[PDB]
Amino acid sequence: STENRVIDLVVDENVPYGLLMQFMDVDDSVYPSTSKPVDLTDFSLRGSIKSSLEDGAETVASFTTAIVDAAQGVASISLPVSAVTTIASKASKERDRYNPRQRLAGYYDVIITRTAVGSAASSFRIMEGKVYISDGVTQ
Amino acid sequence: MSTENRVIDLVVDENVPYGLLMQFMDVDDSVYPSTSKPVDLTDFSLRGSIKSSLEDGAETVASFTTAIVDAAQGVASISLPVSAVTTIASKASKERDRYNPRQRLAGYYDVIITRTAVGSAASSFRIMEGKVYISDGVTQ
Amino acid sequence: AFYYVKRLVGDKFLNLDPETRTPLIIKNKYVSITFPLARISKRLNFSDLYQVEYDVIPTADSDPVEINFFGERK
Amino acid sequence: MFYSLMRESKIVIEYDGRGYHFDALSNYDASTSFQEFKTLRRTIHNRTNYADSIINAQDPSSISLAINFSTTLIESNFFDWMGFTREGNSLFLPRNTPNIEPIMFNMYIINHNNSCIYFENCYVSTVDFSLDKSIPILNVGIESGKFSEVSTFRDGYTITQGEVLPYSAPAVYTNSSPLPALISASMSFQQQCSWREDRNIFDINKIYTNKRAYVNEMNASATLAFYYVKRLVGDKFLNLDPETRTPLIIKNKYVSITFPLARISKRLNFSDLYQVEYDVIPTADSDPVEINFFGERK
Amino acid sequence: MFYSLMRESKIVIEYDGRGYHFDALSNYDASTSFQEFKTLRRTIHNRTNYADSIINAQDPSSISLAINFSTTLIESNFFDWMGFTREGNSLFLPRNTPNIEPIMFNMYIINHNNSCIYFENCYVSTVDFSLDKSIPILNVGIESGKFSEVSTFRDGYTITQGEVLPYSAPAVYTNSSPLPALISASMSFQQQCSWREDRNIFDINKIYTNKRAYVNEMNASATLAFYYVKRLVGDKFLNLDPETRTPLIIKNKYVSITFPLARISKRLNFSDLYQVEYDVIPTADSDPVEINFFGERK
Amino acid sequence: MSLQLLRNTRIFVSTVKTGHNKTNTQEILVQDDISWGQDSNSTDITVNEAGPRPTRGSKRFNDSLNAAEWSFSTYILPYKDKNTSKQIVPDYMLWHALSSGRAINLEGTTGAHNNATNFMVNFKDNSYHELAMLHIYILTDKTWSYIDSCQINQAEVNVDIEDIGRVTWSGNGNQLIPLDEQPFDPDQIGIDDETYMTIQGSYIKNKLTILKIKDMDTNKSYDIPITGGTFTINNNITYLTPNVMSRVTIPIGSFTGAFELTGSLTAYLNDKSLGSMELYKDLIKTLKVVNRFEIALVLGGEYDDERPAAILVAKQAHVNIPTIETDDVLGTSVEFKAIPSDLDAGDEGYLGFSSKYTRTTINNLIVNGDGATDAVTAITVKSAGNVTTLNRSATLQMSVEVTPSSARNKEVTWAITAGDAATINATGLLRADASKTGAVTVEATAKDGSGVKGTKVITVTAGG
Amino acid sequence: MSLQLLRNTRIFVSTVKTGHNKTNTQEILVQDDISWGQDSNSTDITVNEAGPRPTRGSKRFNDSLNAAEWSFSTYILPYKDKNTSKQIVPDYMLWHALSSGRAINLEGTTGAHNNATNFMVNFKDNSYHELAMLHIYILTDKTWSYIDSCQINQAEVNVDIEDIGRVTWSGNGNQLIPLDEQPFDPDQIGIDDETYMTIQGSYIKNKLTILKIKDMDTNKSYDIPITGGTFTINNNITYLTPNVMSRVTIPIGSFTGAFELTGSLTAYLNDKSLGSMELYKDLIKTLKVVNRFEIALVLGGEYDDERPAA
């Protein structure tokens, strides 16, 4: 368990990217952990892809948040193929050790937010990590 | 007979407000089992400050905002707004650590709970201590 | 086998508590054994430099354990 | 990040609310582990491959310390904590074990950057040292029930071991007649306790730690190694016959273990130079075994 | 005083009233010990700490001798004492064990200044020697019942081992066809006796020593090590199949152990150079196993 | 039909196996002691029988090849190049492959990076299992050859007085490969006469060697005239070779060991103040498990006018307990090891090479880490309005003036040392109270670690 | 502000750390090969990881100090002193601390004891775990120092013909301590010119070396003209140092080993009666596990008129 916010995204060159997050609320009080999904009301997600963590870093791209099926908790984060091309343009020429197709493009993090659901701006970061562009061959 | 854990290291998130709440509970070990009643925080105030070093003359990075949430349940919350988080992020050490470039050392913090009144004794008490770290964020 | 390393006082990520389910992967440039969910038990040895030792087995309901074989260029 | 070096450590034993920082520590060894219940439920329906393992208990820790003798004699507290009665600077082995449960204490293993490992519910289970031609050192062995990681701790600034005692050759006597050709006198003292496992159904879904224990027995023992030496033909003093009761003392300039009456068994080895080996235990009705601790000038 | 050096010793075996001083002794090992009955009577009244130990028996001694081959062949008496029948200079393994009890003899280990250790009621329980590329030597193993310290003794001035036999390469044959690529031929002979403990209530308050024993079995065995060698494709003579009955002889210039019919089991090891290992025992109806002792010129 | 002489060998260091240009390959001026090669392992299988007519025959198998060994010695020859006008040592890529495992970037701040003032090498970025990868090219007369995928194992520097400053390189390679065709024209890549003149203008003589040692636990600088010494940069690199029974194998990859920066310094015993005898007596009287010494070995000497020099700096060093070397003149040996503050921090030490070191340049290299970044030299603290005293319940916000005026770190800290009659804050706003009739002091020190002192005795009185 | 030369070293041997007089301390005339010091032990703790971006850093700890080593060579210089009129060697307390573990008593009969005829050293009273305890005082030019609680480990004597009779001492001490103040006036304690003349009157030349060997099992004295040899008096003394992880330690006590008195004697083969060839042939013909020989090596030769000898 503990914390696992750090996960790295590998986006594909020349292909639009879309991620599907099934938000969930597991509780291990009872031995079969409760599968209750969180209910997505007054929730907005924001995420930017910025090269390096230093202050003043240029914004490589910005995630486009989608909220669908609020009852069952799922949500989608995506960005158009034009955003993918803009990301791939500024990616470094050095390739990842384990995969000779990925190149480090920047860092990211998405931040959930409650906007005055109880007169509170309860915004906290969901996940984080590095964004990797995977060089394509089709185009 | 056991040990306390006054030394606690906090990790804040850049561009996000940080909220920590402490509950003070009275305890006792007797013939009947452990009886716990919340401590009534009346005339109880908190105050915390952050400096970049322990040595005298250290630059004050920021200070924490203190509040009491529920006296009957003995809950007090110690936190700082997002602007203070940005201020501490600016003043943090620039030295990164591999395997996790996010975290940077920000300084040392202390929290004193005090009860000041004419009939009350001038008693302070350092409830905690430790170091403050920052998880750098890219959004905002 | 690791070295006992802690980054914070009272750290939560790195400690000696057991982990009922956690995704683990022992990765190389040519092979990667994946445990979709793992049961980790820790053991500390007070040797010349403190060493912690894990005992990783897949959980009851974990997905099949992966063993990838990359020849060259993954 | 912060690595943890054994050489950069400090071991403090917490007893009665006071910290006994045991300096002059040559070497210590410890380990922590957990107990699992791993069963594989292979059925005719599904011959599964994935076990059902849950961590439910902490395996008791076995900590061993090697401590040099010191001028302030803090190390005699290990005999004191292990059950011996005290009069002045001499420790008696009581005729009967005083209490059912041993003397429990906590122990810290401090390290830099507020790092610590907290062993709780410890008891001294073994103490043995060899009086030989090398510097004497007593290896103590304690068993813990619960181990934990804590931020702040207890550090024995004042209660500490002084300078190590200078070497002095051992000598074993019978009354006041010296025993010739000594090789190595090894003494052993034990408090063979046993953990009382009380893991019950109220501890399901929880980690269990041993808390209570009882003393099976205490004992004092010594193994003496000599060279087979005879002064007369058909000698009576030095031979291989057993000795039901004989007063023995393994004496040094700083320590003297006394057996008011001893049961000696002899064993001859036909090695390069013939060696006899004694097995000294106190008799049934013998007076309490003495262990004197002389700091300086007796 | 008088120390006891192993190099300054003399081992004399007393049989039939004659002393067999076994010179050409490379090395011997022996030990003496006593048996104790140590019980701790912990009661609800007094949870005592002092045991009730009484020495009541002498643990049987296990003496091992390593004796070089000699020109006078005194060492064949160990086969003679262990139970083999004698005809000339050749020792037969009898089809049936002759007597229930082994052949008992006493042994002295002499040292300077009238010092001695007297092992009594001994019997030869093991004899094995390895014919190899080093000088052959047979390690005999005898077990004693009673050990004692005596002033005067028996010293074999005349009966003694002569000069050691010169080395000669071993060779193993089948009838008269040599077996190629020998590495190490090890022979083993045993008289697996057992002590009959008859400690009774009439021996209370006394030290008991074993006195009588019976032979469980005698046997002759040999382990042969070869290199895996084949001369033909699909060879019949040299292979890994077991051989129910085949005449074998492990021959030397001074000794020849003969198996009139042998049961051979083979074992192949895929080492740096492939090695096969035999396990030679005589068959059910095989004629008595021969052991010839040639001093010089056969 | 020709014999090849060792005197005609020429060594080129490359980071690429193709596209050789002046930024990837340069000639390395080597000496007589150059050596290279590759050894092979074998095995004999012998039958060991015991019978008569035994088999007496053996058989040999080639089983593996060892890692290629190479070594050579070069002179420490700092100079400034005309193209970039930045001080650089000709064998700079050797220093980089020794220092860090990243791609070479002289414009950066880690590993081998140069400047308009000096050439610098720091080990702050050597946490890699495979450091920067070189390819040594060997040209003997006409035939070519090279060692594939080399790694700089160590660099020996022997401080041998009455001799020139020299460094000995050692390392290992995967395989030594003989080349039949010319990889690159050695005439163009090799150093020309102009840069040769520029280099020979600058030589480092080991005789003019000053040493700067200071006990950080006591603030005691010693004056130790050296007799002879040496320091090493060691990587403990081990090359892994696979074991295959059917075919011979060559090493496939390597793994760097523990980075060690040790040294040994011999000097005569001096009875003068802060001499060798005082250091030896202090070290054998303290008997401490750990030592914190600052060691700055300055090859080539320090002078007001511009001189060449090579400097090794160990900020937090560890000094062994010295021993007395009984010779015709009594002496001692100061064996040290540069340890880091934290294991995974690097920064065990650094080096600075240049043909232009004024004393101030080496001083600010030692105390700031770079020869270009100026460092404070002296301080006199100033009050608020040239005030000489203070009365009870009065503030005194004191300021500071520093020299030089171009120091990078112009800030100071504040403290009270002697007397208890006032308190000071971070900014310097000294505050007092009543019942203060004693003389109190105030102090200030810079944050760059120069060791500059700012003192003032203010005569605080009870007032009129 | 001065450099110290080895040629100005002066060595004094003492049994007391205070109250230094002429009966507790005397100067020992040493040679060029004098040497002393003390070495220290350490340890490096290195992290050995396997992953990419591994930690490459070490750390050193001082853990213990070794026993101090000292050695020097002196000439065998017997003479008679004017005060007692008994033959005595100047480095007699060295011989005593080598020979016995009791307090020095030249009037006795064990260890180093003298007489009106000769100075004698026997090892009849060396059954001690800690022999007589000395303190070597070293004076180099102006600065003082000494080794605390030394013990004579061995004494090498090399019979090197065409050279003077000399003995080489070796030993160990608990700790080498540098002294800032003068312990005793070296002018008074040091040997004066009169005793120097008396000593230089008597020298032992290794060339004039007769050897007396006799087989006690056969009563056969041999005439062996020596070519070169050596004999040693060895104590095999080992110094014990405690192991403490938190603080460095110095040796605390010692324990003497097995006392060995060996030798080696080279000579040419002689065909004459009772020569080297006869001894060699007898020894290789008997082939006995034990031998009983009487050996009396006489340095300096034997003569009717008075001559020095060891």
Swiss-Prot record, chain A:
It comes from the Viruses. GO terms for cellular component: virus tail, fiber. It comes from Escherichia phage T5. This is Collar protein p132. InterPro entries: LtfC/p132/Gp6_b-sand. It is found in: Virion. Forms the collar, into which the side tail fiber protein pb1 is anchored. It holds the Pfam family LtfC. Homododecamer. Interacts with baseplate tube protein p140. The keyword Cell membrane does not apply. Keywords: Late protein, Viral tail fiber protein, Viral tail protein, Virion.
Swiss-Prot record, chain C:
Signal peptide: none annotated. Keywords: Late protein, Viral tail protein, Virion. GO terms for cellular component: virus tail. It is found in: Virion. Forms the simplified baseplate, together with the p132 collar protein ring and the cone (DTP-pb9 and BHP-pb3). Homotrimer. Forms a pseudo-hexameric ring. Interacts with collar protein p132, DTP-pb9 and tail tube protein pb6. This is Baseplate tube protein p140. It comes from Escherichia phage T5 (Enterobacteria phage T5). The chain holds residues 225 to 298 of 298 of the full protein.
UniProtKB/Swiss-Prot annotation, chain F:
It holds the Pfam family Big_2. It is found in: Virion. Keywords: Late protein, Viral genome ejection through host cell envelope, Viral long flexible tail ejection system, Viral penetration into host cytoplasm, Viral tail protein, Viral tail tube protein, Virion, Virus entry into host cell. SUPFAM superfamilies: Invasin/intimin cell-adhesion fragments (SSF49373). It comes from the Viruses. One of its GO terms (biological process) is viral release from host cell by cytolysis. Residues 375-453 form the BIG2 domain. Residues 40-59 are annotated as: Disordered. Its main location: virion. The C-terminus possesses an Ig-like fold of the Big-2 family. Polymerizes to form the tail tube of the phage. Tail tube protein polymerization takes place around the tape measure protein (TMP-pb2) and is probably directed by chaperone proteins. The tail tube is involved in viral genome delivery during ejection. Homotrimer. The tail tube is made of 40 stacked trimeric rings. Interacts with baseplate tube protein p140. This is Tail tube protein pb6. It comes from Escherichia phage T5 (Enterobacteria phage T5).
